[PDB]
Amino acid sequence: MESQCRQNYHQESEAGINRQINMELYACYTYQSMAYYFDRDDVALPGFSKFFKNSSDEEREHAEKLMKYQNKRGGRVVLQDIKKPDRDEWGTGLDAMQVALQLEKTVNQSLLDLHKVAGSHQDAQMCDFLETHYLEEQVNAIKEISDHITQLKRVGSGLGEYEYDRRLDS
Amino acid sequence: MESQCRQNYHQESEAGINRQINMELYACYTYQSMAYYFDRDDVALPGFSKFFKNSSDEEREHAEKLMKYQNKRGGRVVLQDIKKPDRDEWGTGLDAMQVALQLEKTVNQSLLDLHKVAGSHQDAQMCDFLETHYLEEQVNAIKEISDHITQLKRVGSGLGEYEYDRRLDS
Amino acid sequence: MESQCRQNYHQESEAGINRQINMELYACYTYQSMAYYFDRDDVALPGFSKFFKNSSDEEREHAEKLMKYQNKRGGRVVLQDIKKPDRDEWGTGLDAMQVALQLEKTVNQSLLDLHKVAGSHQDAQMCDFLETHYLEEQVNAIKEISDHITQLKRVGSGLGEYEYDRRLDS
Amino acid sequence: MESQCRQNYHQESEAGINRQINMELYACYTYQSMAYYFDRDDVALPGFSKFFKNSSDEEREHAEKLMKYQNKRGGRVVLQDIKKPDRDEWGTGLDAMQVALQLEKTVNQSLLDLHKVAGSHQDAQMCDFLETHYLEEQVNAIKEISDHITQLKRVGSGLGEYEYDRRLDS
Amino acid sequence: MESQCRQNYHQESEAGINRQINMELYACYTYQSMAYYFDRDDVALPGFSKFFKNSSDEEREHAEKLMKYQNKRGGRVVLQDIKKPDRDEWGTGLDAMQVALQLEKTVNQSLLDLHKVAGSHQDAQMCDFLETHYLEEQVNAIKEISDHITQLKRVGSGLGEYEYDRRLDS
Amino acid sequence: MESQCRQNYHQESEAGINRQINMELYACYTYQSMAYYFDRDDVALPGFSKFFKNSSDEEREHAEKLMKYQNKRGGRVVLQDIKKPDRDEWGTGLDAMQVALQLEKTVNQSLLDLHKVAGSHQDAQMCDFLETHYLEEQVNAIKEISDHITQLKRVGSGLGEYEYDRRLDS
Ligand SMILES: [Fe+3]
Ligand SMILES: [Fe+3]
Ligand SMILES: [Fe+3]
Ligand SMILES: [Fe+3]
Ligand SMILES: [Fe+3]
Ligand SMILES: [Fe+3]
């Protein structure tokens, strides 16, 4: 029952998209966890909460665009369990930004590996789709989070973290 | 490290909220699956796709409001794996609406059991929170989906399903 | 042929809603009678006429919302005769307001008994529906009519009743 | 205590108006029944529901205009029981439209008999009142419902009934 | 001289409302004290001053709504002395927020005890009134003040307290 | 710890302001009592209710301006119990206006005694503050209430009191 759409779309690329979908949803869930961690009364950093809630929404949007792409190419979406996040509590604002940077680098490596799979099969359209809609945003997200980390080291604990939280809330 | 917020909030109610969060996220994931199933080129029902994408977004919003409520009361959000949906393909529009009705009844029973836990501990605020923000919407959602099922039986397969899809897309 | 909607909805609650529907329609009919009584040429109190016509319309709206609720829960609307009002003529403005207070207290007692039936079966949603959409309005209506009665005793017969009629017409 | 208004108003005409009031209220109640029948989850025809709810409201308005007319002429409104509708369930859309046509013809015959009573007593004003505000609308209502019946026979059961329901909802 | 309004309103519930009125007025007075404490020239924290003045106004509004409710149900408002606040000076911003949290928890416990009295007498309307207009706001107020306390511990004394004062003034 | 603000501010004037604060709050409480007395279902005079609620709010505003003035001058606000009002019920509209006149004259005498204390210590600014913001308003309030009393004697009991209530509600 090969899809009437399918053309130049390798089954390895199709499986890679399904793998990437689960990875994006995993990142979504971790950011959702962080968002409500910073909403705890004994944490109470609403700027960090908003930053990670927005990051969560953006990851969900990335996953759904991959689901849409899967269908466009005639592939078939196959979902797996979304594994719960690595921690239940995420420390300081700086701690969570550090985790976010490693998470974004993990998603980026996964996308770079997916791009290699697509290129190996001369899937020129899928390569450009990944470059345009995924790879550029990862480079921007990693730079932005790195800037946040550097600034959070500069301002220090206590009042410094409070002031940076105001910046994220603004 | 009992939260400075906590008052009249039983640990059984707190665990019940965490259980309900995972249930809402599970329903979210199933609706997300259906949404992109109806986006398949060999299904191609964009009205059903939109209906289930919106249902998915609403379930996500319900889960996040429970996470917010957990924090308001001084409880602690503890997330578990989001289990993948029961199926990979969802049949006809009528088939998927039937599954949706059973899913909504499952979430509703779970909320009714949660309300009993809250009432047992005379958690009057949590009872009203659940009634106002969860129980009324479940009654409306179940009626709406039941209406859809009846109409989909009336219009039948083929052109009938196409016409009802237009109604959901409108 | 149990409705596909039905969940946590006891047949005693379903019969109680049908009983309440007939009670609301009965109150509607009595207020309609009063409205056109005060439109008689030998009564000629257009403010009282308008007050009771509006009360009649509100009772009709309450009955229809119960019919809608019956359907939402999967119950089945069963209508009975609407008994004609207790009188054909309603006396003075004060007389009719006194009858209205007893009528509203009768409807309120009936709703309070219905709420007990719902609570007995742990129908948490139906309890909140009745509290939100019926019980609060009864408390307000009873206070408002009691205020009217006190004022009508203050102003007395003749010119006093005329002046209060202007207030209701305003 | 003959009303100071009364002139050229026969007691037979006055009783006939009271009879007609009860007939209009009866039709109101039957249409109200149909409206909430089509709101059942196992019927789920919101266009038919709206059509009969509007018909119900129009019958109520006709009854109240007769009550107003009774008072204008110096007659006295005397209300009777409103008998419950002939059925609890009304079948298909076509079935209910058929019942509506017979109901409207029954009300029309009753008004035609009332017009004869008025004319017999040379009540020229009451004849014109009935012609202008009741008889013309009955002819229009009967034609409109007959058109609906013919169209519902044309479109047939299933998808046809669904499409006509959309027309009534529009 | 039982009020013509009174229905399903127990004298224990009526006394409980009068007790709650005095409690709300007491909280009002304490917040008023704090507001003008932070207006002292040797304290000079106008953001904290505004926060507690607004809290004072909200407590006054809660008390007046209970007085209004007492009258709605046919109970009789009986006022007692408003006891002066526990202190004349309230320390640091953090100190006063700590006192506010304990004050709000005291009012909340009192309302929860009042809700139990109402429920014991199956006063369904009064239960919902308390849940809707009092209990939800207490949960929100306690969370908000707890967030303030956590943030004030984070920012520390001196410049930190000044910066948080700006936040409350904003 | 004499305030850095303090200049030409005698401790007798400072104690007098604290005494006046408690007097204004006492008047506030009495007017609040009257406001909800006229909201009783067996009193039901909403114009009088509004008049005394507004008078209550104005007394509260006067007290807070004295608290603000205390701080401006470097004095220290010291609050005492607010004694409950002299009565629980306030009779007729005329009765309550009579009590209001005596209350306003009591507050006025207290302010006149405070002005003497200030003048004795050549506190020229405090004298002008009291004249501008307190003494003129007392003369206006006493005249206005006296006019109300005279009018309420003119219109008499029953319909007259009702008509004057409309004037206060306007
Ligand atoms: Fe992503
Ligand atoms: Fe949900
Ligand atoms: Fe009603
Ligand atoms: Fe008619
Ligand atoms: Fe309060
Ligand atoms: Fe004053």
Side-chain angles (χ1 to χ4, degrees):
Chain A
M1 63 191 301
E2 165 145 313
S3 149
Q4 61 189 333
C5 299
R6 203 181 186 116
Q7 183 171 32
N8 200 40
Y9 195 49
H10 199 283
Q11 57 179 14
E12 195 186 10
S13 306
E14 174 184 359
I17 285 288
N18 282 333
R19 185 186 61 79
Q20 188 65 36
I21 291 164
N22 190 263
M23 168 82 73
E24 308 278 356
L25 292 174
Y26 176 87
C28 181
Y29 205 15
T30 290
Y31 278 140
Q32 192 176 60
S33 179
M34 291 182 169
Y36 286 93
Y37 168 77
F38 286 103
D39 182 63
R40 280 170 56 158
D41 79 270
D42 54 359
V43 177
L45 289 166
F48 283 89
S49 195
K50 169 188 188 173
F51 177 83
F52 290 122
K53 164 67 177 156
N54 174 260
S55 300
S56 182
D57 292 342
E58 276 164 15
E59 296 288 344
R60 172 124 189 231
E61 284 164 6
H62 302 160
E64 287 178 343
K65 179 177 284 175
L66 292 169
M67 300 180 207
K68 186 85 175 174
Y69 188 77
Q70 185 76 287
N71 280 340
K72 280 190 194 181
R73 294 303 301 275
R76 291 294 167 249
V77 173
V78 182
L79 304 170
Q80 305 298 331
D81 293 357
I82 310 177
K83 290 295 170 199
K84 77 192 183 100
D86 184 52
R87 297 159 63 180
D88 295 333
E89 71 84 40
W90 302 98
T92 64
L94 177 50
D95 290 337
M97 281 296 179
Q98 298 269 35
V99 175
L101 176 63
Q102 291 316 119
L103 176 58
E104 296 291 343
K105 282 175 128 165
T106 299
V107 174
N108 196 30
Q109 190 56 66
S110 177
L111 289 160
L112 291 166
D113 296 343
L114 187 55
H115 189 279
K116 284 172 182 85
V117 169
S120 89
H121 304 295
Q122 290 172 303
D123 196 335
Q125 205 286 303
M126 172 168 178
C127 278
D128 183 69
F129 167 74
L130 289 176
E131 291 154 16
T132 302
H133 296 280
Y134 288 81
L135 292 190
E136 174 178 57
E137 160 61 24
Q138 281 317 113
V139 163
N140 289 333
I142 286 162
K143 177 62 157 69
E144 177 192 344
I145 289 165
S146 301
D147 287 1
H148 288 319
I149 289 162
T150 294
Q151 284 268 62
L152 282 163
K153 290 176 172 179
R154 167 179 288 116
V155 298
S157 76
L159 177 59
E161 179 180 63
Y162 167 89
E163 296 290 339
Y164 207 77
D165 177 80
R166 285 185 54 242
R167 185 199 196 94
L168 297 179
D169 214 356
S170 78
Chain B
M1 63 191 301
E2 165 145 313
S3 149
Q4 61 189 333
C5 299
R6 203 181 186 116
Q7 183 171 32
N8 200 40
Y9 195 49
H10 199 283
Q11 57 179 14
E12 195 186 10
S13 306
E14 174 184 359
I17 285 288
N18 282 333
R19 185 186 61 79
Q20 188 65 36
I21 291 164
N22 190 263
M23 168 82 73
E24 308 278 356
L25 292 174
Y26 176 87
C28 181
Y29 205 15
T30 290
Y31 278 140
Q32 192 176 60
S33 179
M34 291 182 169
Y36 286 93
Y37 168 77
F38 286 103
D39 182 63
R40 280 170 56 158
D41 79 270
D42 54 359
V43 177
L45 289 166
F48 283 89
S49 195
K50 169 188 188 173
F51 177 83
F52 290 122
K53 164 67 177 156
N54 174 260
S55 300
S56 182
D57 292 342
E58 276 164 15
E59 296 288 344
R60 172 124 189 231
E61 284 164 6
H62 302 160
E64 287 178 343
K65 179 177 284 175
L66 292 169
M67 300 180 207
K68 186 85 175 174
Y69 188 77
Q70 185 76 287
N71 280 340
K72 280 190 194 181
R73 294 303 301 275
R76 291 294 167 249
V77 173
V78 182
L79 304 170
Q80 305 298 331
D81 293 357
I82 310 177
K83 290 295 170 199
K84 77 192 183 100
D86 184 52
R87 297 159 63 180
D88 295 333
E89 71 84 40
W90 302 98
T92 64
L94 177 50
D95 290 337
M97 281 296 179
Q98 298 269 35
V99 175
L101 176 63
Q102 291 316 119
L103 176 58
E104 296 291 343
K105 282 175 128 165
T106 299
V107 174
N108 196 30
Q109 190 56 66
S110 177
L111 289 160
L112 291 166
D113 296 343
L114 187 55
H115 189 279
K116 284 172 182 85
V117 169
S120 89
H121 304 295
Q122 290 172 303
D123 196 335
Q125 205 286 303
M126 172 168 178
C127 278
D128 183 69
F129 167 74
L130 289 176
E131 291 154 16
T132 302
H133 296 280
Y134 288 81
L135 292 190
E136 174 178 57
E137 160 61 24
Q138 281 317 113
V139 163
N140 289 333
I142 286 162
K143 177 62 157 69
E144 177 192 344
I145 289 165
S146 301
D147 287 1
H148 288 319
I149 289 162
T150 294
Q151 284 268 62
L152 282 163
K153 290 176 172 179
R154 167 179 288 116
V155 298
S157 76
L159 177 59
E161 179 180 63
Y162 167 89
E163 296 290 339
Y164 207 77
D165 177 80
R166 285 185 54 242
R167 185 199 196 94
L168 297 179
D169 214 356
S170 78
Chain C
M1 63 191 301
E2 165 145 313
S3 149
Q4 61 189 333
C5 299
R6 203 181 186 116
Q7 183 171 32
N8 200 40
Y9 195 49
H10 199 283
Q11 57 179 14
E12 195 186 10
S13 306
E14 174 184 359
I17 285 288
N18 282 333
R19 185 186 61 79
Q20 188 65 36
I21 291 164
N22 190 263
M23 168 82 73
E24 308 278 356
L25 292 174
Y26 176 87
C28 181
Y29 205 15
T30 290
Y31 278 140
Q32 192 176 60
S33 179
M34 291 182 169
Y36 286 93
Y37 168 77
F38 286 103
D39 182 63
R40 280 170 56 158
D41 79 270
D42 54 359
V43 177
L45 289 166
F48 283 89
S49 195
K50 169 188 188 173
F51 177 83
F52 290 122
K53 164 67 177 156
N54 174 260
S55 300
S56 182
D57 292 342
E58 276 164 15
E59 296 288 344
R60 172 124 189 231
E61 284 164 6
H62 302 160
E64 287 178 343
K65 179 177 284 175
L66 292 169
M67 300 180 207
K68 186 85 175 174
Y69 188 77
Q70 185 76 287
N71 280 340
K72 280 190 194 181
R73 294 303 301 275
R76 291 294 167 249
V77 173
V78 182
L79 304 170
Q80 305 298 331
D81 293 357
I82 310 177
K83 290 295 170 199
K84 77 192 183 100
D86 184 52
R87 297 159 63 180
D88 295 333
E89 71 84 40
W90 302 98
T92 64
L94 177 50
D95 290 337
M97 281 296 179
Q98 298 269 35
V99 175
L101 176 63
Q102 291 316 119
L103 176 58
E104 296 291 343
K105 282 175 128 165
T106 299
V107 174
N108 196 30
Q109 190 56 66
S110 177
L111 289 160
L112 291 166
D113 296 343
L114 187 55
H115 189 279
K116 284 172 182 85
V117 169
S120 89
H121 304 295
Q122 290 172 303
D123 196 335
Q125 205 286 303
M126 172 168 178
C127 278
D128 183 69
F129 167 74
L130 289 176
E131 291 154 16
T132 302
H133 296 280
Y134 288 81
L135 292 190
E136 174 178 57
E137 160 61 24
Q138 281 317 113
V139 163
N140 289 333
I142 286 162
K143 177 62 157 69
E144 177 192 344
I145 289 165
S146 301
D147 287 1
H148 288 319
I149 289 162
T150 294
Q151 284 268 62
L152 282 163
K153 290 176 172 179
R154 167 179 288 116
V155 298
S157 76
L159 177 59
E161 179 180 63
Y162 167 89
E163 296 290 339
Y164 207 77
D165 177 80
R166 285 185 54 242
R167 185 199 196 94
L168 297 179
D169 214 356
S170 78
Chain D
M1 63 191 301
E2 165 145 313
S3 149
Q4 61 189 333
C5 299
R6 203 181 186 116
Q7 183 171 32
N8 200 40
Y9 195 49
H10 199 283
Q11 57 179 14
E12 195 186 10
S13 306
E14 174 184 359
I17 285 288
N18 282 333
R19 185 186 61 79
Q20 188 65 36
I21 291 164
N22 190 263
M23 168 82 73
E24 308 278 356
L25 292 174
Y26 176 87
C28 181
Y29 205 15
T30 290
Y31 278 140
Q32 192 176 60
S33 179
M34 291 182 169
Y36 286 93
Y37 168 77
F38 286 103
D39 182 63
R40 280 170 56 158
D41 79 270
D42 54 359
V43 177
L45 289 166
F48 283 89
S49 195
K50 169 188 188 173
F51 177 83
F52 290 122
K53 164 67 177 156
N54 174 260
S55 300
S56 182
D57 292 342
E58 276 164 15
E59 296 288 344
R60 172 124 189 231
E61 284 164 6
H62 302 160
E64 287 178 343
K65 179 177 284 175
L66 292 169
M67 300 180 207
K68 186 85 175 174
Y69 188 77
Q70 185 76 287
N71 280 340
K72 280 190 194 181
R73 294 303 301 275
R76 291 294 167 249
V77 173
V78 182
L79 304 170
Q80 305 298 331
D81 293 357
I82 310 177
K83 290 295 170 199
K84 77 192 183 100
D86 184 52
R87 297 159 63 180
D88 295 333
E89 71 84 40
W90 302 98
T92 64
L94 177 50
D95 290 337
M97 281 296 179
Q98 298 269 35
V99 175
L101 176 63
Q102 291 316 119
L103 176 58
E104 296 291 343
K105 282 175 128 165
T106 299
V107 174
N108 196 30
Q109 190 56 66
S110 177
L111 289 160
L112 291 166
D113 296 343
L114 187 55
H115 189 279
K116 284 172 182 85
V117 169
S120 89
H121 304 295
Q122 290 172 303
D123 196 335
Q125 205 286 303
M126 172 168 178
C127 278
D128 183 69
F129 167 74
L130 289 176
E131 291 154 16
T132 302
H133 296 280
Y134 288 81
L135 292 190
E136 174 178 57
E137 160 61 24
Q138 281 317 113
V139 163
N140 289 333
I142 286 162
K143 177 62 157 69
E144 177 192 344
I145 289 165
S146 301
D147 287 1
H148 288 319
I149 289 162
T150 294
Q151 284 268 62
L152 282 163
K153 290 176 172 179
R154 167 179 288 116
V155 298
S157 76
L159 177 59
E161 179 180 63
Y162 167 89
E163 296 290 339
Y164 207 77
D165 177 80
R166 285 185 54 242
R167 185 199 196 94
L168 297 179
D169 214 356
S170 78
Chain E
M1 63 191 301
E2 165 145 313
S3 149
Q4 61 189 333
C5 299
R6 203 181 186 116
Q7 183 171 32
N8 200 40
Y9 195 49
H10 199 283
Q11 57 179 14
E12 195 186 10
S13 306
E14 174 184 359
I17 285 288
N18 282 333
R19 185 186 61 79
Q20 188 65 36
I21 291 164
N22 190 263
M23 168 82 73
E24 308 278 356
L25 292 174
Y26 176 87
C28 181
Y29 205 15
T30 290
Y31 278 140
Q32 192 176 60
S33 179
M34 291 182 169
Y36 286 93
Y37 168 77
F38 286 103
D39 182 63
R40 280 170 56 158
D41 79 270
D42 54 359
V43 177
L45 289 166
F48 283 89
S49 195
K50 169 188 188 173
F51 177 83
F52 290 122
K53 164 67 177 156
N54 174 260
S55 300
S56 182
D57 292 342
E58 276 164 15
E59 296 288 344
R60 172 124 189 231
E61 284 164 6
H62 302 160
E64 287 178 343
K65 179 177 284 175
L66 292 169
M67 300 180 207
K68 186 85 175 174
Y69 188 77
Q70 185 76 287
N71 280 340
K72 280 190 194 181
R73 294 303 301 275
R76 291 294 167 249
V77 173
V78 182
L79 304 170
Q80 305 298 331
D81 293 357
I82 310 177
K83 290 295 170 199
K84 77 192 183 100
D86 184 52
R87 297 159 63 180
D88 295 333
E89 71 84 40
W90 302 98
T92 64
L94 177 50
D95 290 337
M97 281 296 179
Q98 298 269 35
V99 175
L101 176 63
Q102 291 316 119
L103 176 58
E104 296 291 343
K105 282 175 128 165
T106 299
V107 174
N108 196 30
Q109 190 56 66
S110 177
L111 289 160
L112 291 166
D113 296 343
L114 187 55
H115 189 279
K116 284 172 182 85
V117 169
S120 89
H121 304 295
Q122 290 172 303
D123 196 335
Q125 205 286 303
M126 172 168 178
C127 278
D128 183 69
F129 167 74
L130 289 176
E131 291 154 16
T132 302
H133 296 280
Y134 288 81
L135 292 190
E136 174 178 57
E137 160 61 24
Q138 281 317 113
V139 163
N140 289 333
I142 286 162
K143 177 62 157 69
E144 177 192 344
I145 289 165
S146 301
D147 287 1
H148 288 319
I149 289 162
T150 294
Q151 284 268 62
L152 282 163
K153 290 176 172 179
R154 167 179 288 116
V155 298
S157 76
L159 177 59
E161 179 180 63
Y162 167 89
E163 296 290 339
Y164 207 77
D165 177 80
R166 285 185 54 242
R167 185 199 196 94
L168 297 179
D169 214 356
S170 78
Chain F
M1 63 191 301
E2 165 145 313
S3 149
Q4 61 189 333
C5 299
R6 203 181 186 116
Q7 183 171 32
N8 200 40
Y9 195 49
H10 199 283
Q11 57 179 14
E12 195 186 10
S13 306
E14 174 184 359
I17 285 288
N18 282 333
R19 185 186 61 79
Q20 188 65 36
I21 291 164
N22 190 263
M23 168 82 73
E24 308 278 356
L25 292 174
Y26 176 87
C28 181
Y29 205 15
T30 290
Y31 278 140
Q32 192 176 60
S33 179
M34 291 182 169
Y36 286 93
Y37 168 77
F38 286 103
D39 182 63
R40 280 170 56 158
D41 79 270
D42 54 359
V43 177
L45 289 166
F48 283 89
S49 195
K50 169 188 188 173
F51 177 83
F52 290 122
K53 164 67 177 156
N54 174 260
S55 300
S56 182
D57 292 342
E58 276 164 15
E59 296 288 344
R60 172 124 189 231
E61 284 164 6
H62 302 160
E64 287 178 343
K65 179 177 284 175
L66 292 169
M67 300 180 207
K68 186 85 175 174
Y69 188 77
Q70 185 76 287
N71 280 340
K72 280 190 194 181
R73 294 303 301 275
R76 291 294 167 249
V77 173
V78 182
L79 304 170
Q80 305 298 331
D81 293 357
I82 310 177
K83 290 295 170 199
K84 77 192 183 100
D86 184 52
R87 297 159 63 180
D88 295 333
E89 71 84 40
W90 302 98
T92 64
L94 177 50
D95 290 337
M97 281 296 179
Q98 298 269 35
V99 175
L101 176 63
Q102 291 316 119
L103 176 58
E104 296 291 343
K105 282 175 128 165
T106 299
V107 174
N108 196 30
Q109 190 56 66
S110 177
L111 289 160
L112 291 166
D113 296 343
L114 187 55
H115 189 279
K116 284 172 182 85
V117 169
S120 89
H121 304 295
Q122 290 172 303
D123 196 335
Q125 205 286 303
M126 172 168 178
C127 278
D128 183 69
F129 167 74
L130 289 176
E131 291 154 16
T132 302
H133 296 280
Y134 288 81
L135 292 190
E136 174 178 57
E137 160 61 24
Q138 281 317 113
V139 163
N140 289 333
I142 286 162
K143 177 62 157 69
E144 177 192 344
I145 289 165
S146 301
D147 287 1
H148 288 319
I149 289 162
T150 294
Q151 284 268 62
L152 282 163
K153 290 176 172 179
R154 167 179 288 116
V155 298
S157 76
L159 177 59
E161 179 180 63
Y162 167 89
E163 296 290 339
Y164 207 77
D165 177 80
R166 285 185 54 242
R167 185 199 196 94
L168 297 179
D169 214 356
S170 78

